[PDB]
């Protein structure tokens, strides 16, 4: 299971085995049990990345496929992807990576999450809000239309007991989910 990092500070590398690592450059690192060197992959390179650096000049992020997703960073996206981030991770909240493309309105982040495997269409949140909720309170028609192209149900109400119909904020989504 890969666990994601954002350097807090530069690293600049002192052997060839080394990553050179730069402030806000993403680490992806599968193997933690050594006590002072890990494996890592950082801008499509991997290399030995002193643990020490990983603690102090470097921040975990939870939800890196969401954060992607949701600011609308396709490049990252894809790199989460390659790392073998799940396209289905939940966050605490009980949303996908796709519920916040949505919400943000990036067709980007929709339409690449779609060439994953098995994409989950369906996942209602802690308040029982789908993708299409957001998508349909979002006011996009285009990616209102792609979500249901690729499946996504309408019958879902939210605790609210609004469907993604009672969430659509124009008529071109009132439209489509009608």
């Not at 975990?60 to 390659?82: F, M, Q, T, V, Y």
């Not at 009980?94 to 943000?104: D, E, I, K, V």
């Amino acid at each position: 299971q890969v666990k994601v990092f954002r350097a807090l500070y530069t690293f600049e590398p002192r052997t060839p085995d080394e990553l050179y690592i730069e402030e806000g450059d993403i680490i992806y690192i599968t193997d933690m049990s050594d006590t002072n060197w890990w494996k890592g992959t950082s801008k499509g390179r991997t290399g030995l990345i002193p643990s020490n650096y990983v603690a102090e000049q470097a921040e975990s992020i939870d939800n890196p496929l969401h954060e992607a997703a949701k600011r609308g960073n396709l490049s990252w996206l894809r790199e989460c992807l390659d790392n073998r981030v799940g396209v289905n991770g939940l966050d605490k909240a009980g949303s996908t990576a796709l519920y916040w493309a949505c919400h943000g309105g990036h067709k980007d982040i929709v339409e690449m999450l779609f060439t994953q495997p098995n994409i989950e269409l369906n996942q209602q949140n802690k308040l029982g809000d789908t993708a299409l909720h957001a998508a349909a309170w979002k006011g996009y028609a285009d990616i209102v239309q792609l979500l249901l192209a690729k499946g996504a149900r309408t019958d879902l109400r939210n605790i609210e007991k609004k469907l993604a119909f009672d969430m659509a904020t124009n008529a071109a989504c009132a439209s489509l989910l009608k």
